[PDB]
């Protein structure tokens, strides 16, 4: 499914991402925008042989197991396929785990590059 900006913001808010680990909601919406363009089915093969999955592009070498990545740590303890549904719950739960790390949102390259230090409130401006 391809979410609309406000719809994703509402969903993220219900799942408790607003101010999670000190990051206001707009950060998570921004991240989703640049990581997958709000597409729950986005998949991106990495050079190192890993693949990023879903709305928050979670990596098969460290976070979920896809059954084809040499040395998967599967720290979220979930199959990567669970990250491809229209329901963003599994992706949010794993993202919570990743951002609980000392580096927070820095784990997402797109966030680091396009969202960090910007007016993240613009991502939820005009929403319900």
From Swiss-Prot:
Location of the C-type lysozyme domain: 1-128
UniProt-listed Enzyme Commission number(s): 3.2.1.17
Keyword Hydrolase: yes
Subcellular localization(s) per the UniProt record: Secreted
GO biological process, one term: defense response to Gram-positive bacterium
Pfam families: Lys
Assigned keywords, A-Z: Antimicrobial, Bacteriolytic enzyme, Disulfide bond, Glycosidase, Hydrolase, Secreted, Signal
GO terms for MF: glycosaminoglycan binding; identical protein binding; lysozyme activity
GO CC annotation, single: extracellular space
Substrates-to-products reaction catalysed: Hydrolysis of (1->4)-beta-linkages between N-acetylmuramic acid and N-acetyl-D-glucosamine residues in a peptidoglycan and between N-acetyl-D-glucosamine residues in chitodextrins
Superkingdom in the source lineage: Eukaryota
Disulfide feature: 6-127, 30-115, 64-80, 76-94
Main location: secreted
Keyword Nucleotidyltransferase applies: no
PROSITE patterns recorded: GLYCOSYL_HYDROL_F22_1, GLYCOSYL_HYDROL_F22_2
Oligomeric and partner information: Monomer.
Note: Lysozyme C is capable of both hydrolysis and transglycosylation; it also shows a slight esterase activity. It acts rapidly on both peptide-substituted and unsubstituted peptidoglycan, and slowly on chitin oligosaccharides.
PANTHER family: LYSOZYME C
Known role: Lysozymes have primarily a bacteriolytic function; those in tissues and body fluids are associated with the monocyte-macrophage system and enhance the activity of immunoagents.
Family to which this protein belongs: Belongs to the glycosyl hydrolase 22 family.
The protein's name in its UniProt record: Lysozyme C
